Structure formats: C-alpha cells, structure tokens
Subunit: 103 residues, 3 copies
C-alpha cells in the first residue's frame, strides 16, 4: 500500500499509523483504548479543553475573556492611564476627573 | 490494508479514516467540503489562527507580545511615592497635590 | 485502498496522505525529513512546546501559572472607593481630596 511519509503517515511494523509529533498524541484514556486510540492534541500549562473538545486558554486570577474571546487584564480593578493633556487628575466614581473642578 | 488503530486511524465502513479526538476536527467549511475535509485543530476562546493558519493566543486590553512572542502585561498605573504627601496624576506621572493648592 | 476523504485523508500521487488544515503542519525539521515528516500542531505567538512536546501558553513579564495550570497576573494600583467623592493617593492608600482643600 502506498503511503506518503512526508505527510505524517508511517509503517508501524506492517501497518499504517499516524506519525504524531509535537503538540499531538494518542488518547489512551477512551472507552475503546488501548485497542482504538483517537489522535488528539497534547496540551500543558495555560491551555484546556472545553465541553466540546476545543482548546481554550485557561485563565486564573486577574485574567478574563472580552467580548471577542480575547484574553484581557480586564476585568481587574487595575486602573488605566489618565489623559495626557497637560492637566492634573484625581479619581472619582471609577473615572478620571480634573483637579480643577474641586479647586 | 492493515492499520494501527491504536495510532489514530480507524475503519469507517471499509474505508480508512482519521479517528480525531480532543482538540481536533474536520474542516467542513472548505471549498472541497463536505466530500474532502482536511483535519484541523479545534479552538475556542483565547486562541485564534494567524494568516498562515498557525494557532496564536488572542490578546485584548492590557496584554501584548514581547520580542520573543511571550504574553506580557508591559499601560496600568504603578504605586505613588510613600513619603507622607498626597499625589495626583499629571502627564503620565505622579505630581504632588501641593503645586496646585 | 478505500479512504474516507471527509475524514482528513486524501491521495497524493496515488499514495495515502494526511490532508492537514488550520493549526496543523508536517515537521520538516526532523532527522529523517523530508523523507519522513511527522504531523504536528502549527503554533505562533503566545504558544510554545514544553520538553514533553505539549503546547503551553508562552508567558512573559507580569504573568505566571498558578498551581492549577491557569494564567494569572503576578505592581498596579487597585480601584478607589465608588462613593461619589474625589480621591488622591497618599502613603499607598486612597485618601479623600477634601482633607487637603
């Protein structure tokens, strides 16, 4: 049987196998293992699978996802830079308000 | 044909198929689908593909890549000096309240 | 040979090949390449391999993994109280503007 070994297949003894490299492995923890093992990705710190088997970033304290599914520091109480106009600012009701309005 | 089923292949009514598990799927949205579907990764929040089809982390406010492509936090505000005096924020720096009183 | 082309295999010059899509590529940088190229994931910025060949998020300054493998922030100032009053920063704490007016 003709296989293309430059395209990820090889012979394991007499038999065609996937030749899995970095980031991939065979799932030996299914119902049908070890006889039948699907190929799956191989993931470590920072990455998880969701309920549908998609890879997502695994976020802990201080990180969240925005509206676009992008990772953001949020989200956290951390305070963004005040406007760079030439005037002094103070913090009022979660916003930057000029010092003038109180002088 | 003999196949190694313990290595990610299986038979689907006589035909050799990839047996795709977690993190992987067939792309049924290509020009040649559904009769010919390549295998691709399966990705969700926090991950995207770039122009070359490589997986990257999808970054939003406050995060960016450094020169080595690591995710970094480095424009949120550092602590003001701890000298005994009140400070306000002027031109991206901490300036004493005195200079305006 | 019968192959299921809707499941990630296709013919290339009558040989069976994996039809690799987004997030996958063949590794042409092995000791047996390009005669033999394993299939691997295709990764870019924000992702790396560890020594076990698992994909990890590539973390730079200000970010670390917690003990459950999640990305977390490792020196920014917290939000001031939301009571209706203006605040200034004094001695590593939020102090009302009133006390200085």
């Amino acid at each position: 049987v003709s296989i293309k070994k430059s395209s990820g297949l090889n012979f394991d003894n007499t038999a065609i196998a996937i030749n899995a490299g970095k980031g991939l492995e065979f799932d030996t923890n299914t119902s049908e293992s070890p006889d039948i093992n699907p190929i799956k990705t191989k993931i470590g710190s920072g990455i998880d699978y969701n309920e549908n088997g998609a890879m997502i970033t695994k976020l802990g304290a201080g990180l969240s996802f925005d509206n676009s599914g992008a990772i953001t520091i949020g989200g956290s109480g951390y305070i963004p830079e005040a406007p760079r106009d030439g005037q002094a600012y103070v913090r009022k009701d979660g916003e930057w308000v000029l010092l003038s309005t109180f002088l």
